[PDB]
Write a protein that binds this ligand. Structure first.
Ligand SMILES: *C/C=C(C)/C=C/C=C(C)/C=C/C1=C(C)CCCC1(C)C
Ligand SMILES: CCCCCCCCCCCCCCCCCCCC
Ligand SMILES: CCCCCCCCCCCCCCCCCCCC
Ligand SMILES: CCCCCCCCCCCCCCCCCCCC
Ligand SMILES: CCCCCCCCCCCCCCCCCCCC
Ligand SMILES: CCCCCCCCCCCCCCCCCCCC
Ligand SMILES: CCCCCCCCCCCCCCCCCCCC
Ligand SMILES: CCCCCCCCCCCCCCCCCCCC
Ligand SMILES: CCCCCCCCCCCCCCCCCCCC
Ligand SMILES: CCCCCCCCCCCCCCCCCCCC
Ligand SMILES: CCCCCCCCCCCCCCCCCCCC
Length: 271
């Protein structure tokens, strides 16, 4: 039995095969880029709040708060990665360090728990609904989004120990994800009514961005099993891939999403 690498697939690899210098350093630098971009975004959203009418500024405020939480928690995740493995001169690879704290997904999942409700909420300060009620949409978003992250978090505890449960819990989580997609699509359709064609075009881009960037997360969750129980991805390569797809998803769903909403708000105050 491999006691030290039971908690997650990153630990499992690091306690059996170990990581190449390339995989270790690559992952270290990708995660560093992750939190560095959130700090830049924090400054962008603060400095541009004066460019939008007061009625839309709650969206820029919620983007700045998402940036603070993501900078701090991705910074923690980055330090956790680099401090958890150490180099063995004999084998020439990085292995899980029993004296360290071991790699822990808690930082990222906590970041999601906080940010998902705010990302979904903030669009309701830019578009107008038509036949739907603000409170009803808000409550559906907050409930479904919380459940999606919780059931997902439960799933990842069984990643190494019980793949069957890993997949069943991820399927449950996917149910909530599809309900979010259904609600967001109705919101975008109602928000397109009555606004200018320029604004409708930006909203269409927001919808495509939202759909792709959020679908990246379940992809990264499954990444090391996407080539079978002993394929190319069941390895340090599935780890590099998973961590890269999370970082791309985070920049897109938090920073780029917020920039587009700010551009929509500016467009709206032109008619
Ligand atoms: C800024 C962080 C964001 C927007 C996080 C989004 C997270 C998700 C869409 C997570 C989705 C999941 C599934 C649909 C199934 C597998 C488990 C999750 C939690 C990764
Ligand atoms: C509004 C003007 C947008 C300028 C954004 C430039 C950001 C540069 C990122 C770091 C280089
Ligand atoms: C369309 C409005 C102008 C777009 C500028 C986007 C500004 C986002 C700033 C965050 C990107 C930082 C990139 C370098 C970080 C390393
Ligand atoms: C107001 C002009 C846009 C400011 C760029 C945001 C700061 C990026 C720092 C790198
Ligand atoms: C809610 C705005 C502030 C979010 C900060 C999230 C907590 C930071 C924890 C970092 C170390 C754990
Ligand atoms: C409850 C669903 C969201 C999961 C929160 C888990 C938070 C873990 C905190 C960091 C772990 C390292 C110590
Ligand atoms: C307007 C923000 C409402 C949600 C912020 C906190 C996210 C859930 C924390 C539990
Ligand atoms: C066409 C206006 C840009 C929409 C998508 C922008 C995101 C691409 C990555 C930067
Ligand atoms: C809703 C679940 C989305 C998972 C995307 C994974 C696609 C893998 C294709 C290989
Ligand atoms: C809007 C962001 C575009 C990202 C497209 C998906 C990137 C895939 C990277 C996979 C690497 C293996
Ligand atoms: C309304 C059309 C304008 C869309 C501008 C989107 C540009 C997003 C630029 C921020 C991306 C930062 C990524 C830097 C990673 C290195």
């Amino acid at each position: 039995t491999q006691e030290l690498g039971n908690a997650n697939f990153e630990n499992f690899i690091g306690a059996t095969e170990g990581f190449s210098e390339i995989a270790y350093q690559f992952t270290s630098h990708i995660l560093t880029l992750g939190y560095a971009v959130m700090l830049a975004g924090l400054l962008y959203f603060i400095l541009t709040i004066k460019n939008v009418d007061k009625k839309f500024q709650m969206s820029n405020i919620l983007s700045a708060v998402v940036m603070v939480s993501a900078f701090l928690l991705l910074y923690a995740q980055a330090q956790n990665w680099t401090s958890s493995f150490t180099f063995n001169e004999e084998v020439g690879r990085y292995f899980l360090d029993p004296s360290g704290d071991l790699f822990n997904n808690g930082y990222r999942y906590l970041n999601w728990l906080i940010d998902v409700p705010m990302l979904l909420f903030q669009i309701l300060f830019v578009v107008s609904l038509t036949t739907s009620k603000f409170s009803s949409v808000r409550n559906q978003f907050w409930f479904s989004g919380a459940m999606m992250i919780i059931t997902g978090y439960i799933g990842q505890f069984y990643e190494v120990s019980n793949l069957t449960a890993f997949l069943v819990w991820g399927a449950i989580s996917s149910a909530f994800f599809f309900h979010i997609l259904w609600v967001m699509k109705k919101v975008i359709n109602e928000g397109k009514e009555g606004i200018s064609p320029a604004g409708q075009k930006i909203l269409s881009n927001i919808w495509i961005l939202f759909l792709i960037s959020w679908t990246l997360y379940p992809g990264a969750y499954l990444m090391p099993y996407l080539t079978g129980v002993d394929g190319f991805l069941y390895s340090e390569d599935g780890v590099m891939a998973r961590q890269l797809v999370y970082t791309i998803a985070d920049v897109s769903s938090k920073v780029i999403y917020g920039v587009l909403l700010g551009n929509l708000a500016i467009t709206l105050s032109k008619n």
